[model samples]
Target: YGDITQVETSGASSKTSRQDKLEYDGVRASHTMAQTDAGRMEKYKSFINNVAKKHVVDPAVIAAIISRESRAGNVIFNTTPPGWGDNYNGFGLMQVDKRYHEPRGAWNSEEHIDQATGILVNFIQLIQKKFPSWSTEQQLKGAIAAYNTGDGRVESYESVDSRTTGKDYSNDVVARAQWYKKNGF
Candidate 1:
């Protein structure tokens, strides 16, 4: 009887598929938090605040520019495409287009933080010189547009209702600026 029982158990075990016999190991799972580069974040925050204070523009405006242009420095330009000239048009932090001052050897190299800050400073100076009557909001919008397209577009933007323009570029930037203003930096 014991022999017959052993044979019956063996037959039952053989009937079970190999897949059914498999077992999953219960391994512990864990996730480590990504390290935050506090140094870089602090530097960017200080830089934006300093520029805003010096230019009399809102820090939010600077944040908006940084976000749109480079997502705070992750985005960068590629010059490998054929017919790409100078390879330095879109540049650091703010991604200021260098084509506007190409004749002056501006776009000759990839712009670094100092170069980009200088360009922004000069832009503010130009605004003070040319459109002294324009309000802070107007100047900020103009500068943002100029940074993206060109000075000519900036002038054109003055006459047209920015909301009506294709893609409403100015409106979008201003909205982003407002968001940055409400949030910290």
Candidate 2:
């Protein structure tokens, strides 16, 4: 176990990296309060899995974003103690931008997951389109960074702030996604 990069999880056939376990456990610890009940937890798993499969992105990836963004729908990213949910007037689980009070239906789990994942996919695509030299992995991380920061601003994910007040958001999200991949929602 010491210094081993991979650890057997669920079974001998399933081995996950030590880093993934550490990252997943860290985020999970922080989000313990987010999922109110077993039912809600199941709901979260279903929504993340469904949306992830439908969009062709890793469900764990979206779950990691969801965890970092707002703690699995437990709180809106920008809600004050009393606002409940209205950060930047962003709507939905992914906090879809609602600058003009559009049909905030984005809060609906399915609605928000689809939109958020879709936007992420776009972010990934934009990176490759604007810069042909970036490798696929490079574009992925860049797109992840764009999700946290802005696309046009950060040339790469590493150059930008990670997440949640001076952290590596893109890499962190990717790590969290790894946890989801090796484990579950």
Candidate 3:
């Protein structure tokens, strides 16, 4: 039920109003996931808040990452409790790339969230150093871009979005963060 591809209907005849709002590929699939993730945020609110507080990061940003990365764990394989993504290369809600780092906990556990948030904070600080003259918002966006493509993506504020998946990862994530802010992060 949590698999991202599950959003696609192979033989179904009916489409929800949300499904009908966008084209039937990545656009509609992710939009559907985001819609569900708005409510799914409730499942990890307290723990996410705790992790954010511990790391001095924005809980809304963390929640948005989870939504964008894994659709609040919906876009995961059934191989495990709180499973894997991208053919198991990516793990957990934040989609920690197993190719680079060791996984820390259950995919949905607070420990895993904390690990990923810490990584995000490191990216943010890396961006801050790389772009000392950039505005706070630009720096934050750069870091968001970095989370996907590493600090190399932060060549310029204007081009940061081009470095990530869909070439719109930061803007899309920040918009999702705004929604999370309104919903309670």
Candidate 4:
């Protein structure tokens, strides 16, 4: 409803062309797709609530991640200026980069959702096991960094003697996360 021309134009393009046109256009399409997928959104909310209850994390935090990442859906292709390739790095509902995790598959949206959710679920379980003493806020921050950068980057951020790294990490994700938390699916 915000800008259909931009939405249609952006979503209609091929991935490479979309990447070439503008970085944020892809993000915008991802957001739009998230809002439109009612069935997927229901599944996503259930998954998020389950994870949050299991991990003692706020459901809002998981919602925030979905909002900030792929806008609650796994958007992988565009049809506008037809060109193809996994150029956007396989950003999905969680914005999990396929270039890093699963490099040898077709960048399909459904597959992206399944795989990204699996990865995130596993990661959160691991966080629960490894950092039992960490506060919920700390865990959420670490989880977001891990989701964006990698688990290793999150680990490195923990070992360093710098509030700067943590601050930067918070700066990168917190505001958007907060916005999504306050809003809805």
Candidate 5:
């Protein structure tokens, strides 16, 4: 599925194309994990579609965030309002961090996804405004990074990973989104 040569054609032309090597390993694991996520995502599809459509966001991106944040809820301790992370600071499938904003809805509720995706959409908008000269792809990449850290951390598209966890948050999430798009989310 063109996974081997997949490259994120954003940032800088001189930037290392590590996404390809990462893709090779990820594609193999994702082949299995993505299938599991696809099934786990069934109950949340309606909510995800609605929220994504409402915010004019991609459902695959939202699903990708879910997978990245908590492995489609697999990693989280199923709480009444399911939460994970240190001090249970994160909430819901999206892992809305309590340190930043108050979580909405139950851990498994559609409202939670809606709120979290809304936050993501807001970051995209913020990135668009922050770097008015950037391409659409760069803006999206920056916003994905912002979702991980804060908007101020997106210094440049070339270094979108500068403030992100593992310094590859946006790339990894974008790659996962592609897999989800093909596998069914």
Candidate 6:
């Protein structure tokens, strides 16, 4: 499942990637991981579930975003991304971009997941606004890519193929998300 770089008739272009996460990107049967994840994020269970349901976004899709961004809320990244510019930084679950969504309160695991989930929801809705003609699935994918590489990076609506991980960040995340959905997350 390669990603496509889409350039809609509206004059915006974006690139989407294929699934390329490590084999264990999403949780399956780990009590510790699940417990670790649930403890930090479960507090927002009602909001997370309700937001997705209200927006017709799958809870599993949200779960996958968390997993792909930071091991299902099990870790936090608090430094400038490796290759990102010196001033750019990512933190928490979903690795909230310091480049845009400045950290609020503490940059801890809890804060990250809380912000990341909300941002994901916003991103999907934003995509819907930008691409009113797209199907729900397409809007979802575009939003995922926007999360990975930033909405500005994607201007074309063409798919990409490769054998690398970061090359297809959205695809990897979505695949992991789809997996979570299939496995009954």
* C-alpha lDDT of candidate 6 relative to the true structure: 0.51
Output the better candidate (4/6) by lDDT.
Answer: 6
What lDDT is reached at residue 170 by model 1? Answer: 42
Which pairs clash in the backbone of model 1?
none
Give the per-residue lDDT digits (tens) of candidate 2, residues 68-167: 5665556653455321344455556665555533533345457667877888888778877876786566667667667766677666434544332334
Write the residue-wise lDDT of candidate 6 on 1-185 in tens digits: 11222212111112221122223332222222333354445544565576566555567666666655655434444344331222446665556777777765344444445666667667777777887787666776777777776665655445421222355555555555545444544
Q: Report the poorest 10 consecutive residues by lDDT, candidate 3.
A: 1-10
- Write down the RMSD of all candidates, one decimal each: 23.7, 8.7, 8.4, 10.8, 5.8, 8.6
Task: Score each candidate by Cα lDDT.
Answer: 0.42, 0.54, 0.71, 0.44, 0.72, 0.51
Whichever of 1 and 2 has more lDDT, that candidate is 2
Q: Model 3, residue 131: what's the lDDT?
A: 84
Any runs in candidate 1 off by more than 4 Å, and if so which? Answer: 1-43, 77-88, 100-111, 125-133, 156-166
Q: What C-alpha lDDT, on a 0 to 100 scale, does residue 86 get in candidate 4?
A: 36
Q: Compose the digit string of candidate 4's lDDT tens values, residues 1-185.
A: 01111111112123422433445433344344334443445656656666556655555445545544543443433523211223555454555565667632333334444555556556555554556676544554555555555555556335311232323333333443343444555
TM-score of each: 0.52, 0.66, 0.80, 0.46, 0.81, 0.59
TM-score of 3: 0.80
Q: Candidate 5's error at 85, in angstroms?
A: 2.2
- The superposed Cα distance between candidate 5 and the true structure at residue 106, in angstroms, equals 0.2
Best by lDDT: 5
Lowest summed-lDDT stretch of 10 residues in model 6? 9-18
lDDT by residue for model 1 over 82-178, one digit each (tens)? Answer: 1122254564556555565432222222234435555655665665456667655466555555555544555643442232223334444455455
Measured by C-alpha RMSD in angstroms, how accurate is candidate 1? 23.7
